[PDB]
PDB file of C-alpha atoms and ligand atoms in Angstrom:
ATOM      1  CA  UNK A   1     -14.168  -8.317  -8.583  1.00 35.72           C
ATOM      2  CA  UNK A   2     -11.728  -5.447  -8.171  1.00 36.62           C
ATOM      3  CA  UNK A   3      -8.961  -5.386 -10.767  1.00 36.69           C
ATOM      4  CA  UNK A   4      -7.733  -1.803 -11.068  1.00 35.19           C
ATOM      5  CA  UNK A   5      -5.901   0.515  -8.658  1.00 31.98           C
ATOM      6  CA  UNK A   6      -8.453   3.352  -8.736  1.00 31.96           C
ATOM      7  CA  UNK A   7     -11.361   1.129  -7.707  1.00 30.84           C
ATOM      8  CA  UNK A   8      -9.184  -0.607  -5.114  1.00 31.76           C
ATOM      9  CA  UNK A   9      -8.223   2.599  -3.312  1.00 31.10           C
ATOM     10  CA  UNK A  10     -11.768   3.964  -3.656  1.00 30.37           C
ATOM     11  CA  UNK A  11     -13.104   0.841  -1.888  1.00 28.86           C
ATOM     12  CA  UNK A  12     -11.304   1.401   1.419  1.00 34.06           C
ATOM     13  CA  UNK A  13      -8.417  -0.861   0.398  1.00 33.99           C
ATOM     14  CA  UNK A  14      -4.733  -0.674  -0.504  1.00 33.68           C
ATOM     15  CA  UNK A  15      -2.547  -2.025  -3.288  1.00 35.17           C
ATOM     16  CA  UNK A  16       0.302  -4.218  -2.077  1.00 38.19           C
ATOM     17  CA  UNK A  17       2.955  -6.199  -3.980  1.00 38.08           C
ATOM     18  CA  UNK A  18       3.112  -9.994  -3.788  1.00 39.17           C
ATOM     19  CA  UNK A  19       0.916 -10.464  -0.723  1.00 39.83           C
ATOM     20  CA  UNK A  20      -1.476  -8.591   1.530  1.00 34.55           C
ATOM     21  CA  UNK A  21       0.102  -7.363   4.792  1.00 36.22           C
ATOM     22  CA  UNK A  22      -0.922  -8.644   8.194  1.00 35.23           C
ATOM     23  CA  UNK A  23      -4.547  -7.939   9.164  1.00 33.04           C
ATOM     24  CA  UNK A  24      -5.454  -7.386   5.481  1.00 34.12           C
ATOM     25  CA  UNK A  25      -7.406  -9.860   3.369  1.00 31.52           C
ATOM     26  CA  UNK A  26      -7.116 -10.036  -0.407  1.00 33.13           C
ATOM     27  CA  UNK A  27     -10.238  -8.822  -2.214  1.00 28.75           C
ATOM     28  CA  UNK A  28      -8.849  -8.539  -5.754  1.00 30.95           C
ATOM     29  CA  UNK A  29      -5.931  -7.120  -7.711  1.00 33.58           C
ATOM     30  CA  UNK A  30      -4.764  -3.619  -8.621  1.00 35.21           C
ATOM     31  CA  UNK A  31      -4.001  -4.512 -12.242  1.00 36.99           C
ATOM     32  CA  UNK A  32      -0.268  -4.031 -11.731  1.00 36.46           C
ATOM     33  CA  UNK A  33       2.158  -6.979 -11.877  1.00 37.46           C
ATOM     34  CA  UNK A  34       1.784  -9.195  -8.818  1.00 38.43           C
ATOM     35  CA  UNK A  35      -0.060  -6.466  -6.900  1.00 36.45           C
ATOM     36  CA  UNK A  36      -3.048  -7.367  -4.725  1.00 34.40           C
ATOM     37  CA  UNK A  37      -5.984  -5.279  -3.557  1.00 31.69           C
ATOM     38  CA  UNK A  38      -6.097  -5.686   0.212  1.00 31.69           C
ATOM     39  CA  UNK A  39      -8.615  -4.658   2.860  1.00 35.26           C
ATOM     40  CA  UNK A  40      -8.868  -5.125   6.612  1.00 35.76           C
ATOM     41  CA  UNK A  41     -12.093  -7.052   7.383  1.00 36.23           C
TER      42      UNK A  41
ATOM     43  CA  UNK B   1      15.337   5.484   7.982  1.00 38.63           C
ATOM     44  CA  UNK B   2      13.573   2.416   6.638  1.00 38.80           C
ATOM     45  CA  UNK B   3      14.774   1.624   3.137  1.00 38.22           C
ATOM     46  CA  UNK B   4      14.045  -2.037   2.441  1.00 38.68           C
ATOM     47  CA  UNK B   5      10.868  -4.138   2.199  1.00 37.61           C
ATOM     48  CA  UNK B   6      11.783  -6.523   5.039  1.00 38.12           C
ATOM     49  CA  UNK B   7      12.349  -3.844   7.678  1.00 33.82           C
ATOM     50  CA  UNK B   8       9.281  -1.951   6.467  1.00 30.95           C
ATOM     51  CA  UNK B   9       6.905  -4.878   6.932  1.00 32.55           C
ATOM     52  CA  UNK B  10       8.565  -6.021  10.176  1.00 30.96           C
ATOM     53  CA  UNK B  11       8.016  -2.513  11.598  1.00 29.89           C
ATOM     54  CA  UNK B  12       4.234  -2.705  11.200  1.00 30.06           C
ATOM     55  CA  UNK B  13       4.169  -0.767   7.913  1.00 26.94           C
ATOM     56  CA  UNK B  14       3.268  -1.522   4.288  1.00 28.56           C
ATOM     57  CA  UNK B  15       5.090  -1.110   0.971  1.00 30.01           C
ATOM     58  CA  UNK B  16       2.661   0.902  -1.118  1.00 27.52           C
ATOM     59  CA  UNK B  17       3.328   1.818  -4.771  1.00 27.41           C
ATOM     60  CA  UNK B  18       3.677   5.470  -5.778  1.00 27.58           C
ATOM     61  CA  UNK B  19       2.338   7.083  -2.597  1.00 25.12           C
ATOM     62  CA  UNK B  20       1.072   6.324   0.896  1.00 23.82           C
ATOM     63  CA  UNK B  21      -2.709   5.769   0.995  1.00 22.62           C
ATOM     64  CA  UNK B  22      -4.976   8.060   2.972  1.00 24.60           C
ATOM     65  CA  UNK B  23      -4.357   7.975   6.758  1.00 19.07           C
ATOM     66  CA  UNK B  24      -0.877   6.450   6.319  1.00 20.03           C
ATOM     67  CA  UNK B  25       2.300   8.344   7.152  1.00 21.09           C
ATOM     68  CA  UNK B  26       5.307   7.853   4.907  1.00 22.84           C
ATOM     69  CA  UNK B  27       8.222   6.671   7.062  1.00 24.15           C
ATOM     70  CA  UNK B  28      10.644   5.772   4.266  1.00 22.17           C
ATOM     71  CA  UNK B  29      10.866   3.505   1.241  1.00 20.51           C
ATOM     72  CA  UNK B  30      11.028  -0.223   0.542  1.00 21.08           C
ATOM     73  CA  UNK B  31      14.348   0.118  -1.280  1.00 18.91           C
ATOM     74  CA  UNK B  32      12.893   0.309  -4.784  1.00 17.42           C
ATOM     75  CA  UNK B  33      12.044   3.423  -6.815  1.00 13.59           C
ATOM     76  CA  UNK B  34       8.352   4.144  -6.535  1.00 12.52           C
ATOM     77  CA  UNK B  35       7.737   2.269  -3.284  1.00 14.68           C
ATOM     78  CA  UNK B  36       6.859   4.077  -0.065  1.00 14.03           C
ATOM     79  CA  UNK B  37       7.016   2.528   3.391  1.00 13.67           C
ATOM     80  CA  UNK B  38       3.731   3.620   4.963  1.00 13.39           C
ATOM     81  CA  UNK B  39       2.627   3.197   8.573  1.00 10.28           C
ATOM     82  CA  UNK B  40      -0.790   3.786  10.096  1.00  9.19           C
ATOM     83  CA  UNK B  41      -0.471   6.136  13.098  1.00 11.09           C
TER      84      UNK B  41
HETATM   85  C1  PIO C 101      -4.975  12.829 -10.237  1.00  9.67           C
HETATM   86  C2  PIO C 101      -3.714  12.543  -9.419  1.00  9.67           C
HETATM   87  C3  PIO C 101      -3.532  11.035  -9.228  1.00  9.67           C
HETATM   88  C4  PIO C 101      -2.874  10.720  -7.879  1.00  9.67           C
HETATM   89  C5  PIO C 101      -3.799  11.140  -6.736  1.00  9.67           C
HETATM   90  C6  PIO C 101      -3.394  10.458  -5.430  1.00  9.67           C
HETATM   91  C7  PIO C 101      -4.579   9.696  -4.844  1.00  9.67           C
HETATM   92  C8  PIO C 101      -4.779  10.026  -3.364  1.00  9.67           C
HETATM   93  O1  PIO C 101      -3.988  10.677  -2.772  1.00  9.67           O
HETATM   94  O2  PIO C 101      -5.917   9.534  -2.714  1.00  9.67           O
HETATM   95  C9  PIO C 101      -6.063   8.152  -2.842  1.00  9.67           C
HETATM   96  C10 PIO C 101      -7.055   7.841  -3.970  1.00  9.67           C
HETATM   97  C11 PIO C 101      -8.349   7.229  -3.424  1.00  9.67           C
HETATM   98  O3  PIO C 101      -8.551   7.602  -2.089  1.00  9.67           O
HETATM   99  P1  PIO C 101     -10.024   8.127  -1.565  1.00  9.67           P
HETATM  100  O4  PIO C 101      -9.835   8.835  -0.247  1.00  9.67           O
HETATM  101  O5  PIO C 101     -10.637   9.088  -2.555  1.00  9.67           O
HETATM  102  O6  PIO C 101     -11.021   6.828  -1.359  1.00  9.67           O
HETATM  103  C12 PIO C 101     -11.879   6.811  -0.248  1.00  9.67           C
HETATM  104  C13 PIO C 101     -11.518   5.608   0.632  1.00  9.67           C
HETATM  105  O7  PIO C 101     -11.530   4.446  -0.165  1.00  9.67           O
HETATM  106  C14 PIO C 101     -12.510   5.445   1.793  1.00  9.67           C
HETATM  107  O8  PIO C 101     -12.184   4.295   2.528  1.00  9.67           O
HETATM  108  C15 PIO C 101     -13.951   5.333   1.278  1.00  9.67           C
HETATM  109  O9  PIO C 101     -14.825   5.250   2.370  1.00  9.67           O
HETATM  110  P2  PIO C 101     -15.617   3.828   2.641  1.00  9.67           P
HETATM  111  O10 PIO C 101     -14.623   2.785   3.102  1.00  9.67           O
HETATM  112  O11 PIO C 101     -16.286   3.363   1.368  1.00  9.67           O
HETATM  113  O12 PIO C 101     -16.653   4.044   3.715  1.00  9.67           O
HETATM  114  C16 PIO C 101     -14.319   6.553   0.420  1.00  9.67           C
HETATM  115  O13 PIO C 101     -15.611   6.367  -0.095  1.00  9.67           O
HETATM  116  P3  PIO C 101     -16.614   7.669  -0.212  1.00  9.67           P
HETATM  117  O14 PIO C 101     -16.926   8.188   1.173  1.00  9.67           O
HETATM  118  O15 PIO C 101     -15.952   8.763  -1.016  1.00  9.67           O
HETATM  119  O16 PIO C 101     -17.894   7.252  -0.892  1.00  9.67           O
HETATM  120  C17 PIO C 101     -13.335   6.740  -0.739  1.00  9.67           C
HETATM  121  O17 PIO C 101     -13.635   7.929  -1.426  1.00  9.67           O
HETATM  122  O18 PIO C 101      -6.426   6.960  -4.869  1.00  9.67           O
HETATM  123  C18 PIO C 101      -7.038   6.824  -6.117  1.00  9.67           C
HETATM  124  O19 PIO C 101      -8.219   6.838  -6.196  1.00  9.67           O
HETATM  125  C19 PIO C 101      -6.222   6.654  -7.396  1.00  9.67           C
HETATM  126  C20 PIO C 101      -4.733   6.486  -7.104  1.00  9.67           C
HETATM  127  C21 PIO C 101      -4.040   5.908  -8.344  1.00  9.67           C
HETATM  128  C22 PIO C 101      -3.404   4.546  -8.042  1.00  9.67           C
HETATM  129  C23 PIO C 101      -1.889   4.679  -7.912  1.00  9.67           C
HETATM  130  C24 PIO C 101      -1.359   3.755  -6.814  1.00  9.67           C
HETATM  131  C25 PIO C 101      -1.120   2.358  -7.375  1.00  9.67           C
HETATM  132  C1  PIO C 102       4.195  -3.275  -7.959  1.00  9.06           C
HETATM  133  C2  PIO C 102       4.227  -2.780  -9.404  1.00  9.06           C
HETATM  134  C3  PIO C 102       3.800  -1.317  -9.464  1.00  9.06           C
HETATM  135  C4  PIO C 102       4.975  -0.411  -9.104  1.00  9.06           C
HETATM  136  C5  PIO C 102       4.876   0.891  -9.901  1.00  9.06           C
HETATM  137  C6  PIO C 102       6.133   1.724  -9.643  1.00  9.06           C
HETATM  138  C7  PIO C 102       5.761   3.139  -9.204  1.00  9.06           C
HETATM  139  C8  PIO C 102       6.527   4.178 -10.026  1.00  9.06           C
HETATM  140  O1  PIO C 102       7.394   3.852 -10.764  1.00  9.06           O
HETATM  141  O2  PIO C 102       6.217   5.535  -9.882  1.00  9.06           O
HETATM  142  C9  PIO C 102       6.671   6.004  -8.650  1.00  9.06           C
HETATM  143  C10 PIO C 102       7.212   7.434  -8.758  1.00  9.06           C
HETATM  144  C11 PIO C 102       7.452   7.940  -7.338  1.00  9.06           C
HETATM  145  O3  PIO C 102       8.734   8.504  -7.243  1.00  9.06           O
HETATM  146  P1  PIO C 102       9.806   7.901  -6.137  1.00  9.06           P
HETATM  147  O4  PIO C 102       9.147   6.844  -5.288  1.00  9.06           O
HETATM  148  O5  PIO C 102      10.987   7.305  -6.862  1.00  9.06           O
HETATM  149  O6  PIO C 102      10.325   9.111  -5.143  1.00  9.06           O
HETATM  150  C12 PIO C 102      11.308   9.990  -5.622  1.00  9.06           C
HETATM  151  C13 PIO C 102      12.673   9.555  -5.086  1.00  9.06           C
HETATM  152  O7  PIO C 102      12.621   9.495  -3.679  1.00  9.06           O
HETATM  153  C14 PIO C 102      13.778  10.538  -5.487  1.00  9.06           C
HETATM  154  O8  PIO C 102      14.962  10.160  -4.831  1.00  9.06           O
HETATM  155  C15 PIO C 102      13.451  11.982  -5.097  1.00  9.06           C
HETATM  156  O9  PIO C 102      14.412  12.825  -5.684  1.00  9.06           O
HETATM  157  P2  PIO C 102      15.721  13.269  -4.781  1.00  9.06           P
HETATM  158  O10 PIO C 102      16.370  12.049  -4.172  1.00  9.06           O
HETATM  159  O11 PIO C 102      15.272  14.190  -3.674  1.00  9.06           O
HETATM  160  O12 PIO C 102      16.711  13.987  -5.666  1.00  9.06           O
HETATM  161  C16 PIO C 102      12.058  12.414  -5.563  1.00  9.06           C
HETATM  162  O13 PIO C 102      11.769  13.650  -4.960  1.00  9.06           O
HETATM  163  P3  PIO C 102      10.853  14.753  -5.770  1.00  9.06           P
HETATM  164  O14 PIO C 102      11.165  14.709  -7.247  1.00  9.06           O
HETATM  165  O15 PIO C 102       9.393  14.451  -5.557  1.00  9.06           O
HETATM  166  O16 PIO C 102      11.180  16.126  -5.233  1.00  9.06           O
HETATM  167  C17 PIO C 102      10.969  11.417  -5.164  1.00  9.06           C
HETATM  168  O17 PIO C 102       9.748  11.796  -5.746  1.00  9.06           O
HETATM  169  O18 PIO C 102       6.258   8.149  -9.477  1.00  9.06           O
HETATM  170  C18 PIO C 102       6.214   9.532  -9.295  1.00  9.06           C
HETATM  171  O19 PIO C 102       7.221  10.142  -9.198  1.00  9.06           O
HETATM  172  C19 PIO C 102       4.867  10.250  -9.212  1.00  9.06           C
HETATM  173  C20 PIO C 102       3.698   9.369  -9.673  1.00  9.06           C
HETATM  174  C21 PIO C 102       4.028   8.522 -10.904  1.00  9.06           C
HETATM  175  C22 PIO C 102       2.867   8.542 -11.901  1.00  9.06           C
HETATM  176  C23 PIO C 102       1.685   7.726 -11.379  1.00  9.06           C
HETATM  177  C24 PIO C 102       0.426   8.592 -11.349  1.00  9.06           C
HETATM  178  C25 PIO C 102      -0.815   7.699 -11.341  1.00  9.06           C
END
């Protein structure tokens, strides 16, 4: 899946530390420590 | 303004690294260098 910050932000998603914020679901990582790639369904 | 991660997330915003993603307004920081508190208008 997604594991780098460029692809994450180019896929309609955001990078967030630790956990994905409310209304976002985790779809991968952004390659940075403890950072998740997060997207609203 | 908002300057800690708790108040940022409890205000309906996100702590995004480096910059606020497209369509998010920066409303402060999450207390750490390189974190922006970003809220969707
Ligand atoms: C060169 C300067 C570098 C800084 C530039 C600052 C970057 C900046 O200000 O814009 C954000 C940008 C991506 O945002 P960008 O708007 O381009 O991405 C679009 C967005 O994902 C849309 O949701 C997509 O539409 P859809 O949902 O598919 O329908 C759209 O697809 P398409 O319509 O185009 O096909 C995407 O293009 O981020 C980075 O890529 C790398 C950041 C590095 C990560 C750092 C953060 C950890
Ligand atoms: C979760 C793990 C990941 C976390 C990663 C951690 C992220 C990371 O470490 O970088 C964030 C940092 C952002 O800077 P940062 O959030 O600290 O914001 C600066 C800070 O507010 C200073 O106080 C300001 O100076 P002053 O008070 O007014 O005197 C300064 O104003 P100015 O100087 O702008 O005028 C602000 O920029 O990076 C960059 O600068 C540009 C892109 C960096 C390169 C990246 C490009 C891809």
